[PDB]
């Protein structure tokens, strides 16, 4: 926010019975969500004029019918999109907001990622929605083994 | 070249820098420029070749 | 709009107005209007009359000097460019300048016509009129002006 | 060939290997077989996803290959500019074909070119000819008053500039539409049906909207591109490639086009009192504008479209939207075109 602007698409989206055998969820919030969360709720970020790459993630939810078929699981992914959107914005600015999140704050993100894919499996149509959400699966878990290693190292 | 008029009776271009052999390149970036500077005489450079011209052997792009 | 309902009264009123006399530099003490008998007025002294009979006043005897400074107009088009296109873009009560320095104006009506006082130069007797503006077209020298009262003080 | 979440998979797996011993009943997250077996089962599950989305796009292809209905490639952005001259002309000047445009707001750096010689007339004053702009996309869609200068010596140019904005710059065409055109074309197969004129007038890339209206022994077609403004050339072009679809027995004309004007007021209560400023007035007053000009001759204004166009915005950030003039639909007539004129937001 401090450095560049962000989509309006992303903007909009981002300030808003089953259960698997294996994953538990959880609707605990990180702290880092907390704090970053009100400054996108709030008018005091930058924000282009125009959109492009339609082929991301957030327009394949936006197009697909999961906000009134299933408000609980969109809940979720916007749970999961707050969490992914503020550790990518530490690291490439803004290095004060480090020491605010830890590893638990990231491991219940996979239990929440693992839950809901399973819900969206059992439709055909979230096919392009899950075959995102299972490449950051891998992704988060990589960032839990070295969070703790590079808090000391920063 | 000097000596060079390029007339037409009662006829007359509207951009100036016409009927001389002056040519104009414009263009907001060097990637732009670059392009029409080459692209304006590489074509007409012919040769022998069995084959083609310079153009098919050198790619002169992802300028930036 | 002012400038349009008092270029249309004068429209209206135009045949009745014959009293009026055109001369080059008529600055008479007496209003038009106001009195039958016959007076000598040339175009800035009739647009500033027309002008009084409202609330606003201006100023006397309103030359060329009284649009460069007084801030009364804001220039619609600049001089030294004559387009024969642009001319139905314009609009009713429009100031109209002739002459290469400024030596008359005019009113903009419709249908492609201005008011104005034309005659010989030795005081003519010729009285107010309307003409078309294919024959002025010559020497219309590009320059139009426009009135605003909302702003100013 | 059914697609299958990654859990069903792996629990299947666990059962088929836990027959026959006894032995390996711990799955904890941390045992490393619960590891390997998630890797295979999250490899099958993305193969069998990759799998349908290439069957999707070996269909697709199939469609293309069969009836040789190629999808639309990027289409060129192009429309029209004003020259004018410090004095009137002369003399007949001569304009060839490939003179260049350019903008000089550094904004919209894009390029533009003729493709069809233009010459004045003498006596004249101003004349307006096309420009087609080298770049394809997004880009072409400058706005208004975008183009200043000729970029070239211009002697007898004081200025340049353009009184209509460019909208035919476009995108490549998404799987719907290509779908949406090949039913069209299916359905086009029996001439002499208006369905089938729908197709043989669209069958040119550039034009978008395009309606028939038919009477008793005549046959008349209306059609514009984006920008609303039909052309003699896309006339003759329209006419030289329908002939393998016109009524054999009937007269047919391509011609009729108008700009029918409309002024839109709306009130919207904004769920946030603060945050009312001017600045998101202009910014829905932009979105208004943009979707009433791509409407089309065919499509007609209707009040619930609207509200759908503009509460694309979240509802948590606009709670309430109401028209104090529009109360009921407006039946376009077939010539003319329903398009913004102008618009006037307040919030209350």
């Keep these: 926010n401090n450095f560049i602007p962000q989509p309006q698409g992303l903007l909009r989206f981002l300030n808003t019975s089953f259960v698997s055998k294996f994953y538990t969820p959880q609707l605990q919030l990180s702290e880092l969500a907390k704090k970053v969360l009100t400054n996108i709720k709030t008018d005091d970020i930058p924000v282009l004029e125009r959109e492009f790459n339609d082929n991301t993630i957030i327009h394949k939810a936006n197009d697909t019918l999961l906000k009134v078929q299933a408000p609980r699981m969109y809940m979720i992914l916007q749970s999961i999109v707050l969490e992914a959107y503020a550790i990518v914005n530490c690291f490439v600015e803004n290095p004060s907001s480090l020491k605010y999140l830890t590893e638990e704050d990231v491991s219940i993100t996979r239990e929440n990622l693992n839950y809901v894919a399973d819900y969206l499996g059992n439709y055909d149509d979230y096919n392009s929605v899950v075959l995102d959400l299972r490449d950051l699966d891998l992704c988060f878990s990589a960032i839990e083994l070295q969070l703790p290693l590079i808090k000391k190292e920063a | 070249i000097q000596e060079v008029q390029a007339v037409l009776p009662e006829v007359g271009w509207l951009i100036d820098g016409d009927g001389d052999n002056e040519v104009k390149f414009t263009g907001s970036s060097a990637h732009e420029v670059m392009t029409g500077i080459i692209r304006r005489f590489i074509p007409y450079m012919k040769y022998n070749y069995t084959e083609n011209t310079i153009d098919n052997y050198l790619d002169y792009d992802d300028l930036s | ?153 | 060939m059914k697609t299958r979440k990654l859990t069903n998979i792996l629990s299947k797996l666990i059962d088929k290997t836990m027959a026959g011993t006894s032995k390996i009943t711990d799955f904890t997250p941390g045992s490393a077989s619960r590891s390997l077996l998630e890797a295979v089962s999250l490899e099958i599950e993305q193969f069998y996803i990759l799998t349908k989305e290439n069957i999707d796009w070996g269909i697709q292809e199939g469609i293309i290959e069969a009836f040789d209905f190629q999808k639309r490639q990027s289409k060129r952005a192009y429309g029209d500019v004003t020259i004018q001259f410090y004095q009137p002309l002369d003399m007949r000047m001569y304009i060839p074909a490939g003179t260049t445009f350019t903008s000089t707001r550094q904004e919209y750096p894009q390029q533009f070119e003729t493709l069809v010689d233009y010459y004045a007339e003498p006596d004249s004053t101003e004349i307006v000819v096309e420009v087609y702009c080298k770049e394809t996309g997004v880009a072409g869609n400058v706005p208004e008053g975008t183009i200043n200068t000729i970029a070239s010596g211009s002697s007898l140019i004081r200025s340049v500039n353009n009184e209509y904005s460019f909208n035919t710059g476009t995108k490549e065409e998404s799987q719907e539409d290509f779908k949406r055109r090949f039913h069209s074309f299916v359905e086009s197969r029996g001439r002499a049906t208006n369905k089938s004129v729908r197709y043989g007038a669209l069958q040119i890339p550039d034009v978008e909207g395009v309606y028939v209206y038919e009477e008793t022994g005549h046959i008349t077609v209306f059609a514009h591109d984006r920008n609303g403004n039909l052309s003699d050339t896309l006339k003759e072009d329209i006419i030289d490639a329908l002939q393998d679809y016109r009524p054999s027995g009937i007269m047919l004309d391509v011609t009729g086009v108008e700009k029918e004007e409309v002024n839109v007021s709306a009130t919207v209560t904004i769920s946030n009192k603060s945050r009312i400023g001017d600045t998101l007035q202009k910014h829905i007053e932009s979105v208004i504008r943009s979707y009433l000009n791509n409407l089309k001759t065919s499509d007609d204004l209707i009040i619930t479209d609207l509200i759908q166009a503009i509460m694309n915005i979240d509802d948590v950030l606009i709670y309430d939207v109401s028209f104090d003039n529009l109360d009921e639909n407006i039946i376009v007539p077939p010539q003319g075109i329903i398009r913004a004129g102008e618009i006037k937001v307040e919030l209350k």
């Design chain 3, 1 to 153: 709009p002012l400038s349009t309902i008092l270029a249309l009264d004068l429209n209206d009123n135009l045949k009745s107005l014959s009293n009026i006399k055109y001369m080059f530099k008529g600055a008479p003490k007496e209003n038009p209007f106001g009195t039958d008998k016959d007076v000598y007025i040339d175009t800035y002294n009739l647009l500033y009359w027309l002008y009084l009979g409202e609330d606003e006043e201006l100023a006397y005897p309103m030359n060329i000097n009284y649009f460069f400074t007084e801030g009364r107009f804001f220039t619609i088009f600049g001089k030294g460019h004559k387009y024969k296109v642009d001319v139905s873009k314009f609009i009713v009560g429009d100031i109209l300048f002739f002459g290469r320095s400024d030596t008359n104006i005019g009113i903009y009506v419709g249908d492609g016509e201005f008011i104005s006082m034309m005659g010989k130069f030795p005081k003519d007797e010729t009285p107010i009129g309307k003409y078309k503006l294919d024959d002025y077209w010559n020497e219309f020298n590009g320059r139009v002006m426009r009135f605003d009262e909302e702003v100013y003080i």
